């Protein structure tokens, strides 16, 4: 708690990350100042990094694409014939797929039932508060 010349050199000595910029510093001894914050250091460096990897959302897009692919296509197609006679056809295909690449959305029953008539607003009531008719409790004393 020294009068800023000191706080600043101390920040350097103590290896405060960055340094004083962003800190609030005491001055003198009392009659308390120090609502003063040194503005964040200009051009705080973005140290070179390799932090970008496919995001999980990017992964979901890819995994969902995989699911769609395997929903429609086999996991693996055999190549056992390929060049045998003209049988590019007749290759066995592998349809069992890892759970992580299976679809998982339940039957869209609420989109398929198609009730013949649209829903309504199920209004119910007890009627008017007959003892509350023509009775105003919102009166400013005059």
């Amino acid at each position: 708690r020294l009068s800023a010349a000191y706080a600043i050199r101390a920040a350097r000595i103590s290896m405060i990350p960055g340094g004083v910029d962003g800190l609030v510093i005491n001055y003198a001894e009392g009659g308390e100042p120090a609502w003063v914050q040194y503005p964040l250091k200009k051009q705080k460096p973005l140290p070179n990094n390799l932090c970008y990897t496919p995001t999980l959302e990017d992964i979901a897009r890819k995994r969902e694409a995989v699911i769609a692919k395997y929903t429609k296509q086999p996991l693996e197609t055999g190549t056992t014939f390929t060049h045998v006679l003209n049988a590019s056809h007749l290759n066995e295909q592998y349809t069992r797929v890892k759970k992580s690449a299976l679809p998982d959305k339940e039957f869209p029953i609420i989109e398929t039932e198609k009730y013949p008539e649209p829903p309504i607003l199920w209004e119910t009531t007890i009627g008017a508060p007959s003892r509350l008719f023509d009775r105003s409790d919102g009166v400013k004393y005059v």
């Binding site: 999980l56 969902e64 998982d104």
Partner: peptide, 14 residues
Amino acid sequence: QLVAYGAQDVYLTG
């Protein structure tokens, strides 16, 4: 665990 991610997670973390 993080990699185990897909459409069902959108409602929680998308």
